[PDB]
Every structure is written in structure tokens, then in C-alpha cells.
């Protein structure tokens, strides 16, 4: 089949990771000297094809800078969210930038430090607030709220 040569050609040009000449791409694939693979590659928007010489661009996301990361975050407010694969494939080692992007400049959820950490891509404002002492958090969870209308009465007796 020629479709296996198409997907093998796309996986090969993804193994290269940089734009090369079309004729050089046909020479690297040895027996893949078909033009229908080149045409189906022109029909494919996953690997953008520049008509100037031989250039093959790769999209998931063009985000590789913290600013582009902030913009891609702003394009997810009141919607959904992507995953970690697209960012780590578009830019190597994103977790380092996440650790450098302090206070809601890049958030995640640390689950396990043994399974590449399934990430998260959302934005707010501060989010840090780790200066709150653990003792104050323990004293915050031990407070049992008076349910029903007892709480407003207990607050109106104190004057708040």
C-alpha cells in the first residue's frame, strides 16, 4: 500500500524534526519515490507544506515561550483545556518553565513523581499563597460551622 508509505513518510519527517528538501526526503525514504505521497502531504494540514523549496512545518501547538503559554491559557477561559502531550512535544521540558512561572503564571496538579505527572493548563491570578502557615490551615479545618440559621445569629451577636 501507498498509505503506509504516506504515514511512514510523515513519521519519518517527524523523526527529522526540521524542514528538509522534498527530493532529499524522497532520497531518505529510498523506495518511496511516489508523487501521490507528496500530494497527500500537501493535502495534510498537520504537517504544513511551504511552496518555497522544501519546507515541512509541524503544528500540536506552536507554544514554546512563556508568553505564548499565557496566550494559549487565555484562549481556554470559560471553555475546556488541553493536556501535557502537546506542550511537551512542542517544547521539551515544560515542567521546568512551570516551576519557574511562579504564582499562577503556569499552574498544574502534582499527582505522582513517577508517571511523568499528568499536567493541567489553566490560569488565574495568585494561586500561590503558600506563605499561609500549615498551622493556620490546621486551625482552619478544625472550625465546625454552625449549620442552618445559627451562623447568621452567631455573627449578629458578635457585631459583624
Amino acid at each position: 500500500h501507498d498509505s503506509s508509505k504516506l504515514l511512514w513518510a510523515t513519521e519519518y519527517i517527524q523523526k527529522k524534526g526540521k524542514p528538509v528538501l522534498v527530493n532529499e526526503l524522497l532520497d531518505y525514504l529510498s523506495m518511496k519515490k511516489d508523487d501521490k505521497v507528496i500530494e497527500l502531504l500537501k493535502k495534510l494540514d498537520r504537517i504544513e507544506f511551504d511552496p518555497k523549496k522544501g519546507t515541512f512545518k509541524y503544528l500540536t501547538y506552536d507554544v514554546h515561550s512563556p508568553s505564548e503559554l499565557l496566550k494559549l491559557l487565555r484562549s481556554q477561559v470559560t471553555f475546556k483545556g488541553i493536556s501535557c502531550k502537546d506542550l511537551k512535544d512542542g517544547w521539551p521540558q515544560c515542567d521546568e518553565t512551570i516551576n519557574q512561572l511562579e504564582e499562577d503564571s503556569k499552574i498544574l496538579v502534582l499527582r505522582t513523581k513517577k508517571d511523568k505527572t499528568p499536567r493541567y493548563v489553566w490560569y488565574n491570578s495568585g494561586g500561590n499563597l503558600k506563605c499561609i502557615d500549615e498551622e493556620f490551615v490546621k486551625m482552619w479545618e478544625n472550625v465546625q460551622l454552625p449549620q442552618f440559621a445559627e451562623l447568621p445569629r452567631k455573627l449578629q451577636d458578635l457585631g459583624l
Binding site: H1, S3, S4, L7, W8, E11
Partner: protein, 189 residues
Amino acid sequence: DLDLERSNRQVWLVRLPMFLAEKWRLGKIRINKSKITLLLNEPHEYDLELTKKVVENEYVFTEQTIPKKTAIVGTVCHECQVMPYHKIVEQRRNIVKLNNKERITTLDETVGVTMSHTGMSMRSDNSNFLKVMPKKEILDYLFKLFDEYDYWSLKGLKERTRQPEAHLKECLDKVATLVKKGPYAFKYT
């Protein structure tokens, strides 16, 4: 296509004793003008009583929603009943009241043999009952299976290609997309 043949035929119904009836399962009837008998072949003669003289609304038919072939025989003419060396028949009737069953058999052995066959006896079985890779070539074969049919489950592909399954999974995660829902659920296309 049910059709009445005649019905004009006159038939007599007979309630026979069990030994002669099971024997019938030939004789000569002697009609004596209001008492009639029967001279069987050597053997007894039998008086047959006029059980019911008038016997209307009773007929006889034969069979050759599901309709079947139905034929009509004849009208019932007289209800009858055969009445019966009678001492031998009376003795046979007394003799039928002697049916018995076999009692439970007591095994007389030295017990230790049977008790050895009960639990563990170092003897099992003896009866059958309720006993009950290059990635490129694999990719090409997968595209051949796609040529046969685009939709196939991954387990079925693992049952058709017949090879180590890890390499086949890696070959399916590159060129094929896994649909999890819909009618083609758990299938690569």
C-alpha cells in the same frame, strides 16, 4: 380440504379386557336373536352386552392454525362391552395382586475397602467428566487487513496476525486511530 367420506358406516365400540386387548394391540361373533357371543381362535367364547342401545351424537373420524387432512369414517351404531375355564382368569386376577419391589442390598465386605474408596485413596482421574518482529512488515500486514476491512478490533487483529502483541500495539498506535465509542468501539481505523 376436509371431506366426509360416508359417515353411513356403522361402527360398534367395545370395552375389552386387558389381556385380550393387549393381545390385539381373530374370532367369529355369533349374533343370537338379544344375546351375542364371540368364538375366538384356538379360544374362549364371550357374551357381549348391549351396553347402550341409543348412541347418537357419537361418530368416528380419522386424520391423514395448521389445517391437516381430515376424513370422516362412520356413525357409532351401538355401545358395547365384552363380558367373560374362568377359574384360570380369576386366579390370574388374584395373581396380579402380588407385585413387589427389591429391597436395599447390604454390602457385606470388610468395610475398610469401601471406607478406603470413600475418602483419599491415591486414585484420581480414571473418568473424563467436567475436565475441560520488524515494525515495517507488521505495518504492511496491518494495512493489508485494513484493505480487507477498515474496522477491526485490536483483539481480533491480535487473533489474526499471530505474533508478539506488544509490537502489534505499538504498530497500531502509529498508523491507526482507536475509536472507543460508537458502533465501532474499541476499533482501529
